[PDB]
JSON list of C-alpha atoms and ligand atoms in Angstrom, two decimals:
[
{"chain": "A", "resi": 1, "resn": "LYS", "atom": "CA", "xyz": [11.61, -34.78, 28.91]},
{"chain": "A", "resi": 2, "resn": "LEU", "atom": "CA", "xyz": [8.16, -33.29, 27.62]},
{"chain": "A", "resi": 3, "resn": "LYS", "atom": "CA", "xyz": [5.69, -31.52, 30.06]},
{"chain": "A", "resi": 4, "resn": "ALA", "atom": "CA", "xyz": [3.61, -29.28, 27.27]},
{"chain": "A", "resi": 5, "resn": "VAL", "atom": "CA", "xyz": [2.73, -28.79, 23.71]},
{"chain": "A", "resi": 6, "resn": "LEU", "atom": "CA", "xyz": [2.44, -25.41, 22.42]},
{"chain": "A", "resi": 7, "resn": "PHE", "atom": "CA", "xyz": [-0.07, -25.34, 19.59]},
{"chain": "A", "resi": 8, "resn": "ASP", "atom": "CA", "xyz": [-0.27, -22.51, 17.07]},
{"chain": "A", "resi": 9, "resn": "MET", "atom": "CA", "xyz": [-3.94, -21.72, 16.29]},
{"chain": "A", "resi": 10, "resn": "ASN", "atom": "CA", "xyz": [-4.81, -20.40, 12.77]},
{"chain": "A", "resi": 11, "resn": "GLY", "atom": "CA", "xyz": [-4.16, -23.48, 10.36]},
{"chain": "A", "resi": 12, "resn": "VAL", "atom": "CA", "xyz": [-3.12, -25.85, 13.26]},
{"chain": "A", "resi": 13, "resn": "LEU", "atom": "CA", "xyz": [-6.40, -25.82, 15.47]},
{"chain": "A", "resi": 14, "resn": "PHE", "atom": "CA", "xyz": [-8.62, -24.13, 12.93]},
{"chain": "A", "resi": 15, "resn": "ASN", "atom": "CA", "xyz": [-8.89, -24.32, 9.26]},
{"chain": "A", "resi": 16, "resn": "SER", "atom": "CA", "xyz": [-9.03, -20.48, 9.19]},
{"chain": "A", "resi": 17, "resn": "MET", "atom": "CA", "xyz": [-6.35, -19.62, 6.76]},
{"chain": "A", "resi": 18, "resn": "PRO", "atom": "CA", "xyz": [-8.15, -19.61, 3.34]},
{"chain": "A", "resi": 19, "resn": "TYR", "atom": "CA", "xyz": [-10.41, -17.05, 5.23]},
{"chain": "A", "resi": 20, "resn": "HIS", "atom": "CA", "xyz": [-7.68, -14.95, 6.63]},
{"chain": "A", "resi": 21, "resn": "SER", "atom": "CA", "xyz": [-5.68, -14.66, 3.44]},
{"chain": "A", "resi": 22, "resn": "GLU", "atom": "CA", "xyz": [-8.69, -13.78, 1.26]},
{"chain": "A", "resi": 23, "resn": "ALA", "atom": "CA", "xyz": [-9.75, -11.34, 3.73]},
{"chain": "A", "resi": 24, "resn": "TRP", "atom": "CA", "xyz": [-6.08, -9.83, 3.85]},
{"chain": "A", "resi": 25, "resn": "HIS", "atom": "CA", "xyz": [-6.13, -9.71, 0.04]},
{"chain": "A", "resi": 26, "resn": "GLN", "atom": "CA", "xyz": [-9.37, -8.15, -0.44]},
{"chain": "A", "resi": 27, "resn": "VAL", "atom": "CA", "xyz": [-9.01, -5.37, 2.13]},
{"chain": "A", "resi": 28, "resn": "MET", "atom": "CA", "xyz": [-5.67, -4.36, 0.87]},
{"chain": "A", "resi": 29, "resn": "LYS", "atom": "CA", "xyz": [-6.99, -4.23, -2.64]},
{"chain": "A", "resi": 30, "resn": "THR", "atom": "CA", "xyz": [-9.67, -1.67, -1.49]},
{"chain": "A", "resi": 31, "resn": "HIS", "atom": "CA", "xyz": [-7.21, 0.54, -0.09]},
{"chain": "A", "resi": 32, "resn": "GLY", "atom": "CA", "xyz": [-5.21, 0.31, -3.43]},
{"chain": "A", "resi": 33, "resn": "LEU", "atom": "CA", "xyz": [-2.41, -1.82, -2.07]},
{"chain": "A", "resi": 34, "resn": "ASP", "atom": "CA", "xyz": [-1.03, -5.12, -3.22]},
{"chain": "A", "resi": 35, "resn": "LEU", "atom": "CA", "xyz": [-0.99, -8.18, -1.03]},
{"chain": "A", "resi": 36, "resn": "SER", "atom": "CA", "xyz": [-1.61, -11.24, -2.89]},
{"chain": "A", "resi": 37, "resn": "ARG", "atom": "CA", "xyz": [-3.20, -14.25, -1.30]},
{"chain": "A", "resi": 38, "resn": "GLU", "atom": "CA", "xyz": [0.40, -16.11, -1.48]},
{"chain": "A", "resi": 39, "resn": "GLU", "atom": "CA", "xyz": [2.07, -13.15, 0.29]},
{"chain": "A", "resi": 40, "resn": "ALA", "atom": "CA", "xyz": [-0.69, -13.27, 3.22]},
{"chain": "A", "resi": 41, "resn": "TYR", "atom": "CA", "xyz": [-0.07, -16.70, 3.65]},
{"chain": "A", "resi": 42, "resn": "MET", "atom": "CA", "xyz": [3.81, -15.82, 4.16]},
{"chain": "A", "resi": 43, "resn": "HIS", "atom": "CA", "xyz": [2.89, -13.19, 6.55]},
{"chain": "A", "resi": 44, "resn": "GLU", "atom": "CA", "xyz": [0.70, -15.68, 8.50]},
{"chain": "A", "resi": 45, "resn": "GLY", "atom": "CA", "xyz": [1.32, -15.38, 12.35]},
{"chain": "A", "resi": 46, "resn": "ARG", "atom": "CA", "xyz": [2.29, -11.54, 12.32]},
{"chain": "A", "resi": 47, "resn": "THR", "atom": "CA", "xyz": [0.13, -8.89, 14.32]},
{"chain": "A", "resi": 48, "resn": "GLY", "atom": "CA", "xyz": [-2.20, -7.10, 12.09]},
{"chain": "A", "resi": 49, "resn": "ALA", "atom": "CA", "xyz": [-0.25, -3.93, 12.62]},
{"chain": "A", "resi": 50, "resn": "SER", "atom": "CA", "xyz": [3.04, -5.56, 11.43]},
{"chain": "A", "resi": 51, "resn": "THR", "atom": "CA", "xyz": [1.22, -6.95, 8.61]},
{"chain": "A", "resi": 52, "resn": "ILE", "atom": "CA", "xyz": [-0.20, -3.55, 7.40]},
{"chain": "A", "resi": 53, "resn": "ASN", "atom": "CA", "xyz": [3.06, -1.89, 7.99]},
{"chain": "A", "resi": 54, "resn": "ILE", "atom": "CA", "xyz": [4.99, -4.21, 5.86]},
{"chain": "A", "resi": 55, "resn": "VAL", "atom": "CA", "xyz": [2.61, -3.73, 3.01]},
{"chain": "A", "resi": 56, "resn": "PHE", "atom": "CA", "xyz": [2.77, 0.22, 3.57]},
{"chain": "A", "resi": 57, "resn": "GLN", "atom": "CA", "xyz": [6.46, 0.32, 3.72]},
{"chain": "A", "resi": 58, "resn": "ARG", "atom": "CA", "xyz": [7.18, -1.72, 0.61]},
{"chain": "A", "resi": 59, "resn": "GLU", "atom": "CA", "xyz": [4.96, 0.08, -1.31]},
{"chain": "A", "resi": 60, "resn": "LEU", "atom": "CA", "xyz": [4.62, 3.57, -0.30]},
{"chain": "A", "resi": 61, "resn": "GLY", "atom": "CA", "xyz": [7.81, 3.88, 1.79]},
{"chain": "A", "resi": 62, "resn": "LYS", "atom": "CA", "xyz": [6.03, 5.14, 4.84]},
{"chain": "A", "resi": 63, "resn": "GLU", "atom": "CA", "xyz": [4.38, 3.14, 7.62]},
{"chain": "A", "resi": 64, "resn": "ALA", "atom": "CA", "xyz": [0.74, 3.05, 8.17]},
{"chain": "A", "resi": 65, "resn": "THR", "atom": "CA", "xyz": [-0.49, 5.49, 11.15]},
{"chain": "A", "resi": 66, "resn": "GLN", "atom": "CA", "xyz": [-2.53, 4.17, 13.92]},
{"chain": "A", "resi": 67, "resn": "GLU", "atom": "CA", "xyz": [-5.86, 5.37, 12.53]},
{"chain": "A", "resi": 68, "resn": "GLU", "atom": "CA", "xyz": [-4.97, 3.33, 9.36]},
{"chain": "A", "resi": 69, "resn": "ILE", "atom": "CA", "xyz": [-3.98, 0.31, 11.17]},
{"chain": "A", "resi": 70, "resn": "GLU", "atom": "CA", "xyz": [-7.32, 0.29, 13.28]},
{"chain": "A", "resi": 71, "resn": "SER", "atom": "CA", "xyz": [-9.32, 0.99, 10.27]},
{"chain": "A", "resi": 72, "resn": "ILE", "atom": "CA", "xyz": [-7.77, -1.73, 7.90]},
{"chain": "A", "resi": 73, "resn": "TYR", "atom": "CA", "xyz": [-8.12, -4.29, 10.83]},
{"chain": "A", "resi": 74, "resn": "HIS", "atom": "CA", "xyz": [-11.37, -3.44, 11.52]},
{"chain": "A", "resi": 75, "resn": "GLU", "atom": "CA", "xyz": [-12.37, -4.00, 7.77]},
{"chain": "A", "resi": 76, "resn": "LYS", "atom": "CA", "xyz": [-10.41, -7.24, 7.70]},
{"chain": "A", "resi": 77, "resn": "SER", "atom": "CA", "xyz": [-12.40, -8.69, 10.75]},
{"chain": "A", "resi": 78, "resn": "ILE", "atom": "CA", "xyz": [-15.60, -7.99, 9.38]},
{"chain": "A", "resi": 79, "resn": "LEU", "atom": "CA", "xyz": [-14.77, -9.68, 6.01]},
{"chain": "A", "resi": 80, "resn": "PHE", "atom": "CA", "xyz": [-13.20, -12.58, 7.78]},
{"chain": "A", "resi": 81, "resn": "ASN", "atom": "CA", "xyz": [-16.53, -13.06, 9.88]},
{"chain": "A", "resi": 82, "resn": "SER", "atom": "CA", "xyz": [-18.52, -12.71, 6.70]},
{"chain": "A", "resi": 83, "resn": "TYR", "atom": "CA", "xyz": [-17.67, -16.42, 5.79]},
{"chain": "A", "resi": 84, "resn": "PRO", "atom": "CA", "xyz": [-19.00, -19.37, 7.36]},
{"chain": "A", "resi": 85, "resn": "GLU", "atom": "CA", "xyz": [-17.14, -20.13, 10.60]},
{"chain": "A", "resi": 86, "resn": "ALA", "atom": "CA", "xyz": [-13.76, -21.80, 10.25]},
{"chain": "A", "resi": 87, "resn": "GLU", "atom": "CA", "xyz": [-13.95, -25.56, 11.40]},
{"chain": "A", "resi": 88, "resn": "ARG", "atom": "CA", "xyz": [-11.46, -27.65, 13.34]},
{"chain": "A", "resi": 89, "resn": "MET", "atom": "CA", "xyz": [-8.46, -28.82, 11.51]},
{"chain": "A", "resi": 90, "resn": "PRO", "atom": "CA", "xyz": [-8.96, -32.60, 11.09]},
{"chain": "A", "resi": 91, "resn": "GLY", "atom": "CA", "xyz": [-6.74, -34.48, 13.55]},
{"chain": "A", "resi": 92, "resn": "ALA", "atom": "CA", "xyz": [-6.30, -31.66, 16.02]},
{"chain": "A", "resi": 93, "resn": "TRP", "atom": "CA", "xyz": [-8.96, -32.96, 18.47]},
{"chain": "A", "resi": 94, "resn": "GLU", "atom": "CA", "xyz": [-7.48, -36.40, 18.39]},
{"chain": "A", "resi": 95, "resn": "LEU", "atom": "CA", "xyz": [-3.95, -35.07, 19.00]},
{"chain": "A", "resi": 96, "resn": "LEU", "atom": "CA", "xyz": [-5.18, -32.91, 21.87]},
{"chain": "A", "resi": 97, "resn": "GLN", "atom": "CA", "xyz": [-6.72, -36.08, 23.29]},
{"chain": "A", "resi": 98, "resn": "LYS", "atom": "CA", "xyz": [-3.54, -38.05, 22.74]},
{"chain": "A", "resi": 99, "resn": "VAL", "atom": "CA", "xyz": [-1.34, -35.39, 24.47]},
{"chain": "A", "resi": 100, "resn": "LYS", "atom": "CA", "xyz": [-3.60, -34.73, 27.50]},
{"chain": "A", "resi": 101, "resn": "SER", "atom": "CA", "xyz": [-3.79, -38.64, 27.84]},
{"chain": "A", "resi": 102, "resn": "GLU", "atom": "CA", "xyz": [-0.06, -38.57, 28.12]},
{"chain": "A", "resi": 103, "resn": "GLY", "atom": "CA", "xyz": [-0.10, -36.05, 30.80]},
{"chain": "A", "resi": 104, "resn": "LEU", "atom": "CA", "xyz": [1.17, -33.12, 28.71]},
{"chain": "A", "resi": 105, "resn": "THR", "atom": "CA", "xyz": [-0.05, -29.71, 29.01]},
{"chain": "A", "resi": 106, "resn": "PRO", "atom": "CA", "xyz": [-1.82, -28.01, 25.83]},
{"chain": "A", "resi": 107, "resn": "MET", "atom": "CA", "xyz": [-1.14, -24.30, 25.32]},
{"chain": "A", "resi": 108, "resn": "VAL", "atom": "CA", "xyz": [-2.01, -21.86, 22.65]},
{"chain": "A", "resi": 109, "resn": "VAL", "atom": "CA", "xyz": [0.47, -19.52, 21.10]},
{"chain": "A", "resi": 110, "resn": "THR", "atom": "CA", "xyz": [-1.09, -17.45, 18.50]},
{"chain": "A", "resi": 111, "resn": "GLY", "atom": "CA", "xyz": [-0.62, -14.12, 16.65]},
{"chain": "A", "resi": 112, "resn": "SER", "atom": "CA", "xyz": [-4.32, -13.82, 16.36]},
{"chain": "A", "resi": 113, "resn": "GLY", "atom": "CA", "xyz": [-6.51, -11.27, 18.11]},
{"chain": "A", "resi": 114, "resn": "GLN", "atom": "CA", "xyz": [-9.72, -12.62, 16.27]},
{"chain": "A", "resi": 115, "resn": "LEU", "atom": "CA", "xyz": [-12.19, -12.79, 19.08]},
{"chain": "A", "resi": 116, "resn": "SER", "atom": "CA", "xyz": [-14.64, -15.08, 17.19]},
{"chain": "A", "resi": 117, "resn": "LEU", "atom": "CA", "xyz": [-11.86, -17.78, 16.96]},
{"chain": "A", "resi": 118, "resn": "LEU", "atom": "CA", "xyz": [-10.42, -17.31, 20.35]},
{"chain": "A", "resi": 119, "resn": "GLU", "atom": "CA", "xyz": [-13.81, -17.43, 22.05]},
{"chain": "A", "resi": 120, "resn": "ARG", "atom": "CA", "xyz": [-14.57, -20.71, 20.16]},
{"chain": "A", "resi": 121, "resn": "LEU", "atom": "CA", "xyz": [-11.61, -22.55, 21.54]},
{"chain": "A", "resi": 122, "resn": "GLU", "atom": "CA", "xyz": [-13.52, -23.89, 24.66]},
{"chain": "A", "resi": 123, "resn": "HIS", "atom": "CA", "xyz": [-16.20, -25.16, 22.39]},
{"chain": "A", "resi": 124, "resn": "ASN", "atom": "CA", "xyz": [-14.13, -26.71, 19.91]},
{"chain": "A", "resi": 125, "resn": "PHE", "atom": "CA", "xyz": [-11.64, -28.33, 22.23]},
{"chain": "A", "resi": 126, "resn": "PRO", "atom": "CA", "xyz": [-13.56, -28.73, 25.41]},
{"chain": "A", "resi": 127, "resn": "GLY", "atom": "CA", "xyz": [-11.32, -29.17, 28.57]},
{"chain": "A", "resi": 128, "resn": "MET", "atom": "CA", "xyz": [-8.04, -28.51, 26.76]},
{"chain": "A", "resi": 129, "resn": "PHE", "atom": "CA", "xyz": [-6.83, -25.09, 27.18]},
{"chain": "A", "resi": 130, "resn": "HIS", "atom": "CA", "xyz": [-6.76, -22.29, 29.89]},
{"chain": "A", "resi": 131, "resn": "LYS", "atom": "CA", "xyz": [-6.41, -18.47, 29.63]},
{"chain": "A", "resi": 132, "resn": "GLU", "atom": "CA", "xyz": [-3.51, -18.53, 31.87]},
{"chain": "A", "resi": 133, "resn": "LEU", "atom": "CA", "xyz": [-1.83, -20.93, 29.65]},
{"chain": "A", "resi": 134, "resn": "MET", "atom": "CA", "xyz": [-2.45, -19.13, 26.22]},
{"chain": "A", "resi": 135, "resn": "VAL", "atom": "CA", "xyz": [-0.30, -16.32, 24.42]},
{"chain": "A", "resi": 136, "resn": "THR", "atom": "CA", "xyz": [-2.37, -14.22, 22.12]},
{"chain": "A", "resi": 137, "resn": "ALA", "atom": "CA", "xyz": [-2.00, -10.79, 19.90]},
{"chain": "A", "resi": 138, "resn": "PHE", "atom": "CA", "xyz": [-2.95, -9.33, 23.42]},
{"chain": "A", "resi": 139, "resn": "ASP", "atom": "CA", "xyz": [0.21, -10.29, 25.12]},
{"chain": "A", "resi": 140, "resn": "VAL", "atom": "CA", "xyz": [2.89, -9.24, 22.68]},
{"chain": "A", "resi": 141, "resn": "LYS", "atom": "CA", "xyz": [4.99, -6.22, 21.58]},
{"chain": "A", "resi": 142, "resn": "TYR", "atom": "CA", "xyz": [6.46, -7.79, 18.61]},
{"chain": "A", "resi": 143, "resn": "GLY", "atom": "CA", "xyz": [5.00, -11.12, 17.81]},
{"chain": "A", "resi": 144, "resn": "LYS", "atom": "CA", "xyz": [6.13, -13.92, 15.28]},
{"chain": "A", "resi": 145, "resn": "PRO", "atom": "CA", "xyz": [8.58, -14.45, 13.84]},
{"chain": "A", "resi": 146, "resn": "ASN", "atom": "CA", "xyz": [9.92, -12.87, 16.98]},
{"chain": "A", "resi": 147, "resn": "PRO", "atom": "CA", "xyz": [10.27, -15.62, 19.55]},
{"chain": "A", "resi": 148, "resn": "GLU", "atom": "CA", "xyz": [8.61, -13.52, 22.11]},
{"chain": "A", "resi": 149, "resn": "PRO", "atom": "CA", "xyz": [5.26, -15.20, 22.01]},
{"chain": "A", "resi": 150, "resn": "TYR", "atom": "CA", "xyz": [7.04, -18.64, 22.60]},
{"chain": "A", "resi": 151, "resn": "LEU", "atom": "CA", "xyz": [9.24, -17.35, 25.32]},
{"chain": "A", "resi": 152, "resn": "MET", "atom": "CA", "xyz": [6.10, -15.86, 27.08]},
{"chain": "A", "resi": 153, "resn": "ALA", "atom": "CA", "xyz": [4.24, -19.45, 26.86]},
{"chain": "A", "resi": 154, "resn": "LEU", "atom": "CA", "xyz": [7.30, -20.97, 28.64]},
{"chain": "A", "resi": 155, "resn": "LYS", "atom": "CA", "xyz": [7.14, -18.25, 31.36]},
{"chain": "A", "resi": 156, "resn": "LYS", "atom": "CA", "xyz": [3.42, -18.58, 31.85]},
{"chain": "A", "resi": 157, "resn": "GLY", "atom": "CA", "xyz": [3.66, -22.45, 31.92]},
{"chain": "A", "resi": 158, "resn": "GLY", "atom": "CA", "xyz": [6.59, -22.38, 34.35]},
{"chain": "A", "resi": 159, "resn": "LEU", "atom": "CA", "xyz": [8.56, -24.46, 31.44]},
{"chain": "A", "resi": 160, "resn": "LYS", "atom": "CA", "xyz": [12.11, -24.67, 30.26]},
{"chain": "A", "resi": 161, "resn": "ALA", "atom": "CA", "xyz": [12.56, -24.62, 26.35]},
{"chain": "A", "resi": 162, "resn": "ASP", "atom": "CA", "xyz": [13.61, -28.48, 26.34]},
{"chain": "A", "resi": 163, "resn": "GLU", "atom": "CA", "xyz": [10.20, -29.36, 28.29]},
{"chain": "A", "resi": 164, "resn": "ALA", "atom": "CA", "xyz": [8.09, -28.10, 25.29]},
{"chain": "A", "resi": 165, "resn": "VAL", "atom": "CA", "xyz": [7.10, -28.92, 21.67]},
{"chain": "A", "resi": 166, "resn": "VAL", "atom": "CA", "xyz": [5.99, -26.43, 19.23]},
{"chain": "A", "resi": 167, "resn": "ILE", "atom": "CA", "xyz": [3.19, -27.32, 16.53]},
{"chain": "A", "resi": 168, "resn": "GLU", "atom": "CA", "xyz": [3.39, -24.65, 13.95]},
{"chain": "A", "resi": 169, "resn": "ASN", "atom": "CA", "xyz": [2.16, -24.35, 10.05]},
{"chain": "A", "resi": 170, "resn": "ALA", "atom": "CA", "xyz": [3.77, -21.10, 8.93]},
{"chain": "A", "resi": 171, "resn": "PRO", "atom": "CA", "xyz": [7.31, -19.99, 8.19]},
{"chain": "A", "resi": 172, "resn": "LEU", "atom": "CA", "xyz": [7.18, -16.95, 10.57]},
{"chain": "A", "resi": 173, "resn": "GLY", "atom": "CA", "xyz": [5.61, -19.30, 13.41]},
{"chain": "A", "resi": 174, "resn": "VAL", "atom": "CA", "xyz": [8.11, -21.91, 13.07]},
{"chain": "A", "resi": 175, "resn": "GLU", "atom": "CA", "xyz": [11.03, -19.21, 13.06]},
{"chain": "A", "resi": 176, "resn": "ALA", "atom": "CA", "xyz": [9.52, -17.83, 16.42]},
{"chain": "A", "resi": 177, "resn": "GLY", "atom": "CA", "xyz": [9.45, -21.59, 17.85]},
{"chain": "A", "resi": 178, "resn": "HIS", "atom": "CA", "xyz": [12.87, -22.22, 16.52]},
{"chain": "A", "resi": 179, "resn": "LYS", "atom": "CA", "xyz": [14.54, -19.27, 17.88]},
{"chain": "A", "resi": 180, "resn": "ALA", "atom": "CA", "xyz": [12.92, -19.68, 21.40]},
{"chain": "A", "resi": 181, "resn": "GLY", "atom": "CA", "xyz": [15.30, -22.93, 21.49]},
{"chain": "A", "resi": 182, "resn": "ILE", "atom": "CA", "xyz": [12.05, -25.20, 21.40]},
{"chain": "A", "resi": 183, "resn": "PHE", "atom": "CA", "xyz": [11.88, -28.34, 19.37]},
{"chain": "A", "resi": 184, "resn": "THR", "atom": "CA", "xyz": [9.43, -27.28, 16.53]},
{"chain": "A", "resi": 185, "resn": "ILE", "atom": "CA", "xyz": [7.27, -29.53, 14.54]},
{"chain": "A", "resi": 186, "resn": "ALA", "atom": "CA", "xyz": [5.94, -28.08, 11.15]},
{"chain": "A", "resi": 187, "resn": "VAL", "atom": "CA", "xyz": [2.63, -29.33, 9.63]},
{"chain": "A", "resi": 188, "resn": "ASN", "atom": "CA", "xyz": [2.18, -28.09, 6.26]},
{"chain": "A", "resi": 189, "resn": "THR", "atom": "CA", "xyz": [-1.78, -27.56, 6.15]},
{"chain": "A", "resi": 190, "resn": "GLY", "atom": "CA", "xyz": [-1.48, -24.50, 3.44]},
{"chain": "A", "resi": 191, "resn": "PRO", "atom": "CA", "xyz": [-0.44, -24.04, 0.01]},
{"chain": "A", "resi": 192, "resn": "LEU", "atom": "CA", "xyz": [3.38, -23.16, 0.61]},
{"chain": "A", "resi": 193, "resn": "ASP", "atom": "CA", "xyz": [5.93, -25.58, -0.14]},
{"chain": "A", "resi": 194, "resn": "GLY", "atom": "CA", "xyz": [7.25, -27.36, 2.67]},
{"chain": "A", "resi": 195, "resn": "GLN", "atom": "CA", "xyz": [10.82, -26.05, 2.04]},
{"chain": "A", "resi": 196, "resn": "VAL", "atom": "CA", "xyz": [9.66, -22.70, 3.48]},
{"chain": "A", "resi": 197, "resn": "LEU", "atom": "CA", "xyz": [8.84, -24.38, 6.81]},
{"chain": "A", "resi": 198, "resn": "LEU", "atom": "CA", "xyz": [12.09, -26.30, 7.08]},
{"chain": "A", "resi": 199, "resn": "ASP", "atom": "CA", "xyz": [14.13, -23.31, 5.83]},
{"chain": "A", "resi": 200, "resn": "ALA", "atom": "CA", "xyz": [12.50, -21.48, 8.84]},
{"chain": "A", "resi": 201, "resn": "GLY", "atom": "CA", "xyz": [14.05, -24.08, 11.22]},
{"chain": "A", "resi": 202, "resn": "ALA", "atom": "CA", "xyz": [11.49, -26.75, 11.68]},
{"chain": "A", "resi": 203, "resn": "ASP", "atom": "CA", "xyz": [12.95, -29.87, 13.34]},
{"chain": "A", "resi": 204, "resn": "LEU", "atom": "CA", "xyz": [10.25, -32.09, 11.76]},
{"chain": "A", "resi": 205, "resn": "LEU", "atom": "CA", "xyz": [7.91, -31.71, 8.77]},
{"chain": "A", "resi": 206, "resn": "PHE", "atom": "CA", "xyz": [4.45, -33.60, 8.53]},
{"chain": "A", "resi": 207, "resn": "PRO", "atom": "CA", "xyz": [1.84, -33.21, 5.69]},
{"chain": "A", "resi": 208, "resn": "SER", "atom": "CA", "xyz": [-1.03, -32.77, 8.13]},
{"chain": "A", "resi": 209, "resn": "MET", "atom": "CA", "xyz": [-2.20, -32.86, 11.54]},
{"chain": "A", "resi": 210, "resn": "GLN", "atom": "CA", "xyz": [-3.67, -36.34, 11.42]},
{"chain": "A", "resi": 211, "resn": "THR", "atom": "CA", "xyz": [-0.43, -37.69, 10.25]},
{"chain": "A", "resi": 212, "resn": "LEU", "atom": "CA", "xyz": [1.49, -35.74, 12.89]},
{"chain": "A", "resi": 213, "resn": "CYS", "atom": "CA", "xyz": [-1.11, -37.38, 15.35]},
{"chain": "A", "resi": 214, "resn": "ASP", "atom": "CA", "xyz": [-0.65, -40.92, 14.02]},
{"chain": "A", "resi": 215, "resn": "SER", "atom": "CA", "xyz": [3.04, -40.49, 14.18]},
{"chain": "A", "resi": 216, "resn": "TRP", "atom": "CA", "xyz": [3.16, -39.00, 17.72]},
{"chain": "A", "resi": 217, "resn": "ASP", "atom": "CA", "xyz": [4.15, -41.89, 19.96]},
{"chain": "A", "resi": 218, "resn": "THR", "atom": "CA", "xyz": [6.86, -42.93, 17.36]},
{"chain": "A", "resi": 219, "resn": "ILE", "atom": "CA", "xyz": [8.56, -39.42, 17.32]},
{"chain": "A", "resi": 220, "resn": "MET", "atom": "CA", "xyz": [8.31, -38.95, 21.24]},
{"chain": "A", "resi": 221, "resn": "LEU", "atom": "CA", "xyz": [9.89, -42.37, 21.76]},
{"chain": "B", "resi": 1, "resn": "CA", "atom": "CA1", "xyz": [-0.51, -20.49, 11.88]},
{"chain": "B", "resi": 2, "resn": "CA", "atom": "CA1", "xyz": [6.87, -29.49, -4.26]},
{"chain": "B", "resi": 3, "resn": "CA", "atom": "CA1", "xyz": [17.04, -28.20, 9.14]}
]
């Protein structure tokens, strides 16, 4: 049975996705490339380099250079941080309290390298997370949708796949959790159809973090 809950960050702990999607759309627009807001949501969870290389390959037929990757990501971060800071996803704190009260270990598994958000995890969720029990952009070669980040969390936690549950909100992250062989709950906190989360391999679908929190004891029975 359950020992740990592996939380995605963007769109699960923080309501940051309207900002990430907007910044990704606008920065690519400045470089003359097309990435719609919807497409940014479909690429949620990917590393910055992978996101940039997908946009480049499908448009120009070539990948971006390291200098181009660094420059575009640099620009994206500045634009992300120009908006009022992302607030907590409603229900995330209450669920974290619930899982900790039940003796489960909270972990974070994110494709993010966004320092402003990562360094706000303690202030927003006091006493919940530890750096040794987190996987971020800094840990991975491939990143979501590769199961690598979730396999890394299991290792960091000393966990088997059947002792964990994944909470995800995006098709590439759901895929990552599912391909890691972990029970994966999708929470549809964005504008995409819930079908994409289920198609990606989600074992359950809830419309919000708060309803997941309301339903937690029932689903774990
Ligand atoms: Ca996410
Ligand atoms: Ca619908
Ligand atoms: Ca299914």
